[PDB]
């Protein structure tokens, strides 16, 4: 009956609304088709349970009433969106009323739900961080939010540091591709595709072992042995004029950089290199068929590595 009177005179609309007393469906819809959210707030103030009524009414009319895209919200229509954004359009409320905290919360939720585009997830995280920094939160809450965001930032940095050689080998989109984990990062840093894999790459692929999770299930020691075997497969120990030629320079550099001079830092550096195995490494060397080449220099180095 309201649609039939939508073309008729509006002088009887108030009469119909007062005849159908306690009118919510008619009143909130007349206040939603126009820009009179001041009238909507007056109705919510001068009524009983009108807030819980209008909430369920907007929930039922999702896509029909209460949207900020149907009304022209840059005018008195934006003054209307100011009250129509309560708990439903907090995103637009952030733009039109400077709700920085709600903006940061919604952007963080969107970044957490984002899985399709890593670039979009990173952009959402940056926007959330900027909104939180521009918000009026106390020092403690700001520091807590910054640490929570820094956790996700450190998590994303692993995929952000993807190698451009492995990305071109796999023919993956620069920005339209998914993210990776620490295991995938280590595997890519130790992949054969990385021709220029150096001591820094080995140190990174050995330091990325503290973020795996469930080390006893993920077989941390198998990867630790595989990385040390690849560090010698890339060394390619050879012989010159009947004399052993030490090509394990990369392993030597890795073993010299593993020690950060903790003797003066108070850590038990003496006897802190029991991670690498010898017999288990020689098994992998036999599997790779480089044992006869590298076994003399392996023991030669393991002597100065037990003397160090």
């Amino acid at each position: 009956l309201s649609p039939l009177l939508i073309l008729g005179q509006y002088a009887w609309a108030s009469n119909l609304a007062e005849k159908y007393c306690d009118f919510d469906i008619l009143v909130q819809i007349c206040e939603m088709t126009d820009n009179q959210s001041r009238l909507q707030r007056y109705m919510t103030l001068f009524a009983e349970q009108n807030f819980s009524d209008f909430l369920f009414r907007w929930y039922l009319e999702k896509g029909k009433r209460g949207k900020l895209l149907s009304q022209p919200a840059s005018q008195h229509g934006q003054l209307a969106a100011f009250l129509q954004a309560h708990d439903h359009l907090s995103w637009l409320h952030e733009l039109n009323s400077q709700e920085f905290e709600k903006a940061h919360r919604t952007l963080q939720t969107l970044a957490n739900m984002e899985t399709r585009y890593f670039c979009k997830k990173k952009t959402l995280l940056g926007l959330s961080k900027l909104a939180a920094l521009a918000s009026d939160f106390q020092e403690d809450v700001l520091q807590e939010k910054v640490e929570e965001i820094a956790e996700q930032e450190h998590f994303l940095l692993h995929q952000e540091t993807l190698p451009k050689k492995l990305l071109e080998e796999k023919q993956l989109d620069l920005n339209a591709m998914p993210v990776l984990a620490p295991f995938q990062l280590i595997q890519l840093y130790v992949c054969e595709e990385n021709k220029r894999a150096n001591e820094n790459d080995f140190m990174k692929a050995l330091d990325l072992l503290e973020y795996i999770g469930d080390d006893s299930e993920v077989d941390v020691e198998e990867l630790k042995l595989e990385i040390l075997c690849k560090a010698i497969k890339r060394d390619e120990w050879s012989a010159t004029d009947g004399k052993d030629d030490p090509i394990e320079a990369t392993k030597d550099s890795i073993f010299v950089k593993v020690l950060q001079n903790l003797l003066n830092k108070g850590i038990e550096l003496k006897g802190y290199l029991p991670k690498a195995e010898t017999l288990l490494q020689s098994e992998e060397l036999n599997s790779l068929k480089t044992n006869s080449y590298f076994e003399f220099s392996l023991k030669a180095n393991y002597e100065c590595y037990m003397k160090m």
Binding site: S74, E94, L95, N96, Q98, F100, G126, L127, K129, L130, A131, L133, A134, D136
Partner: protein, 44 residues
């Protein structure tokens, strides 16, 4: 009509390489964010 470049000003300011956010006040940065939101409105 460079709405994308205008919205990139947020990242330009928040960039830690320059730390431009430390030179702006609260109200001024809020007004700049409101301008960015107005640009995003035209982008929509």
């Amino acid at each position: 009509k460079q709405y994308k470049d205008c919205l990139r000003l947020a990242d330009i300011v928040s960039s830690e390489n320059q730390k431009l956010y430390t030179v702006f006040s609260k109200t001024e940065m809020r007004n700049l964010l409101q301008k960015l939101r107005e640009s995003s409105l035209m982008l929509l």
